[PDB]
Design a protein around this ligand. Structure first.
Ligand SMILES: [K+]
Ligand SMILES: [K+]
Ligand SMILES: [K+]
Ligand SMILES: [K+]
Ligand SMILES: [K+]
Ligand SMILES: [Mg+2]
Ligand SMILES: [Mg+2]
Ligand SMILES: [Mg+2]
Ligand SMILES: [Mg+2]
Ligand SMILES: [Mg+2]
Ligand SMILES: [Mg+2]
Ligand SMILES: [Mg+2]
Ligand SMILES: [Mg+2]
Ligand SMILES: [Mg+2]
Ligand SMILES: [Mg+2]
Ligand SMILES: [Mg+2]
Ligand SMILES: [Mg+2]
Ligand SMILES: [Mg+2]
Length: 95
RNA sequence: GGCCGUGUGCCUUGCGCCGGGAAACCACGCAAGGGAUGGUGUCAAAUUCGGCGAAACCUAAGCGCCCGCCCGGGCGUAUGGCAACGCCGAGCCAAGCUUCGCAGCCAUUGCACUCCGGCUGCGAUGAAGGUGUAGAGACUAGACGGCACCCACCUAAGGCAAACGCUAUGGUGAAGGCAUAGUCCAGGGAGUGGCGA
């Protein structure tokens, strides 16, 4: 249902057809009114397909995205949203 | 269609040998013979532009030489030819591969930060191999070629085995297709004309 506070959020169960260059722009404008966004990682590989990571500036921007856009029908499919249990390599360089 | 020689290519044997390889066996340098060279299926495309190199054989202008000189001849001799054929640069190519773009189905609910599941469908791509390279040339199929597999034989590194050892993803089963089987038309047989010496 929910994991533990983190800047990055683990998203799965999505439409597995939209291209990498297209899906990055499909998440930019919709998930912007929560705060500053860092980077979005998308992979079409068998392990990572239908899965995406989204990183915000602060926890407040990440928690707002967790509640306001919870279970949004993204391309005819609702999305499962959890916090990333493992910290990203981007955040560790800043801390 | 058959004999007698010539050169070049080819394999076998016998011998050289800073080479690659674990070995088998490739690669080379040469010398002496023609006995020996698996199968089955599959692919039929690009076939273009230039350049380098060549023996046997054909020939003798220039040279030397001799007919005492000249006049004419005679001799040798490629730097002239033809050509088996050895390659090279660029473009291009059918399947089987190496890697990407898009579609389609079968899967998969998956926490990753460098990147990665299958199968058929074109399009693009690397590594072989081919074309270029036949008597001018043209078309047809095949194999002696490309690809996949099978068989025989050798070997045994890696893997397996406590171990005698076992096994190929390693090799070997010639070159021809610089036109091979064929059809076709060039060329000689069979004219005339140019160039050359
Ligand atoms: K002969
Ligand atoms: K050796
Ligand atoms: K050839
Ligand atoms: K062994
Ligand atoms: K020929
Ligand atoms: Mg024989
Ligand atoms: Mg044809
Ligand atoms: Mg004279
Ligand atoms: Mg005279
Ligand atoms: Mg002679
Ligand atoms: Mg000559
Ligand atoms: Mg040529
Ligand atoms: Mg031709
Ligand atoms: Mg042998
Ligand atoms: Mg040929
Ligand atoms: Mg020939
Ligand atoms: Mg022929
Ligand atoms: Mg004539």
């Amino acid at each position: 249902p929910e994991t533990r506070p983190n800047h990055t959020i683990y998203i799965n169960n999505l439409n597995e057809k939209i291209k990498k260059d297209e899906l990055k722009k499909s998440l930019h404008a919709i998930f912007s009114r929560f705060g500053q966004i860092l980077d979005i990682l998308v992979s079409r590989s068998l392990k990572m397909r239908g899965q995406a990571f989204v990183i915000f500036k602060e926890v407040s921007s990440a928690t707002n995205a967790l509640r306001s856009m919870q279970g949004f029908p993204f391309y005819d499919k609702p999305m499962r949203i959890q916090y990333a249990k493992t910290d990203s390599d981007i955040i560790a360089k800043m801390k």
